[PDB]
Every structure is written in structure tokens, then in C-alpha cells.
Amino acid sequence: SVLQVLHIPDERLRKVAKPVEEVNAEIQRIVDDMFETMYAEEGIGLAATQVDIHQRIIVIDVSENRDERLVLINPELLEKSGETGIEEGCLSIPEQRALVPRAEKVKIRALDRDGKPFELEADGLLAICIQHEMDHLVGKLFMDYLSPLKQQRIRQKVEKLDRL
Ligand SMILES: CCCCC[C@H](CC(=O)NO)C(=O)N[C@H](C(=O)N1CCC[C@H]1CO)C(C)C
Ligand SMILES: [Zn+2]
Numbered sequence: 001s002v003l004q005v006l007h008i009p010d011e012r013l014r015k016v017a018k019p020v021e022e023v024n025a026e027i028q029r030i031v032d033d034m035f036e037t038m039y040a041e042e043g044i045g046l047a048a049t050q051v052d053i054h055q056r057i058i059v060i061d062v063s064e065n066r067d068e069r070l071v072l073i074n075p076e077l078l079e080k081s082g083e084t085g086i087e088e089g090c091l092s093i094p095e096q097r098a099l100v101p102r103a104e105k106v107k108i109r110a111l112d113r114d115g116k117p118f119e120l121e122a123d124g125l126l127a128i129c130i131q132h133e134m135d136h137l138v139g140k141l142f143m144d145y146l147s148p149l150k151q152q153r154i155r156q157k158v159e160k161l162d163r164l
Contacts, residue, residue, distance in 0.1 A: 003037045003051040005091045008158055013092055014139040017054045020073050023115030027057070031071055031113060034059045039066060043091050045129045047136030050092050058133040062125060075110040075134055078119070086128060088142050094161055096154050100142045102128045 006013050020027055030053055038046040038059055045060040058072040082104030089097040106127045109119045122130055132142060143154050 001033050001036065002040050003033050003053075005037065005041060005050050006052060007092050007094055007162060008141070008143075008155065010092075012052055013049065013136075013141065015049060015054050016139050017049055017056050017137040020055050020057060020111075023073060023111060023113070027055075027073070028113060030055070030057060031059060035061070035069065041091050044125075045133045046091070047133040049136045049139070056137050058130075058137070060126070060129055060133065062129070069113075071110075071113040072108070072130070072133070073111040073113075073115070075108050075130070077134070078107040078109055080107070081105045084128065086125070088128070088132060090132075090142055092141060093143060093154060094158055096143075096157060098142065098146060098150070098154070100132075100145045102131050106130055 030048065034046050034048060034051060034057065037051060038061065044062055045058065048055050048057040056074050058075060060070040060072065061068060080103035083101055084104040085099045085101050087097045087099050104127065105123050107119065107121050108130060109117065111117050143151050
């Protein structure tokens with residue numbers, strides 16, 4: 001099913017997620033709804049928190065053809081290096097984009113859809129995406145990186161939409 005993405009200033013987006021106990025059939029069902037919502041909203045990644053599900057689950061799919069799924073359950077950052085930044089938009093901040101400073105390279109460890117642990121070295125867009133989803137699980141949004149004035153402008157611009 002398609003799940004409802006929370007938008008600022010919904011306080012639930014600021015909720016820190018607890019680890020997934022064991023990857024079971026219910027966890028795997030949450031992974032599907034998440035992917036389904038991700039593809040529906042034309043997003044390249046998604047974290048459970050945006051859907052009001054407070055567990056450490058993240059789905060990412062960067063393929064043009066939508067057939068290269070990446071599941072990150074209980075992800076942990078092992079190492080990071082460099083700086084970079086692209087204009088990022090967030091489904092929770094409806095239709096806004098901004099350049100956000102991010103580490104250029106990251107090495108993580110996580111459990112896949114079957115609960116099997118795996119390590120991953122990411123660079124480029126994958127590295128930035130992982131960082132942005134992981135931020136979600138800890139109640140953090142890309143605009144938190146911005147100045148008070150920009151955060152203010154983002155908040156006021158979002159506040160003109162959501163209706164329509
Ligand atoms: C790379 C930054 C985070 C990617 C994940 C988000 C979706 C999201 O809210 N995840 O929490 C997304 O699809 N963002 C898109 C996005 O920012 N993209 C699409 C690919 C390129 C990059 C824009 O510069 C927009 C268009 C919806
Ligand atoms: Zn987001």
C-alpha cells in the first residue's frame with residue numbers, strides 16, 4: 001500500500017527510531033509499502049520515519065529502470081571522508097531543494113531484506129542518499145543544515161502549498 005509521507009512541521013518527523021529486533025514477515029511488509037510509496041512519490045530513497053514507522057529501515061533505488069533495490073536495516077556508519085553537495089529535495093519538505101554539505105565517501109554495515117548483514121562503500125549520489133536517509137532515522141532533516149534565514153524561507157514556501 002501507499003503510505004502517507006509526513007511533512008514539516010509534523011513533530012513526528014523529529015522522532016528517533018529504535019532498532020528492528022529481527023527481520024520477519026512484518027518487517028518485510030513494511031519494506032514493500034515503503035518502496036511502493038517511494039516509487040509513487042518519485043523519490044530515489046525512503047526512511048520509515050517519514051511514513052510514521054519508527055524503526056531503522058531505509059529503502060533506496062537509484063536505477064532508471066526501478067530494478068536495483070537496496071535495503072538498509074539497522075545501518076551503521078563505519079567511516080566517512082571528504083565533502084560534497086548537490087541540490088537535495090525531500091518528500092517531507094514537499095517541493096523545495098537546496099545544496100547541503102555531505103561527506104563525499106561513506107562505508108556502512110547493515111542487514112539486508114533477509115536480515116543478512118553486509119558492508120557497503122558508497123560514493124557520489126549513493127553516499128549522499130544514504131546520509132540523507134540515515135539522518136531521517138534520527139529525526140534530522142536536510143534543512144537543519146541551513147541558516148536560520150534559509151530555514152525560514154523554506155518553512156514559509158512550504159506553507160503556501162500542501163493544499164492546492
Ligand atoms: C539525493 C537526495 C535524497 C534523495 C531521496 C529523496 C526522497 C526522500 O525524501 N528521502 O528521504 C529524493 O528522491 N530526492 C530527489 C532528489 O533530491 N534527487 C533526485 C535525484 C537527484 C536528486 C536531486 O538533485 C527529489 C527530486 C525528490
Ligand atoms: Zn527526505
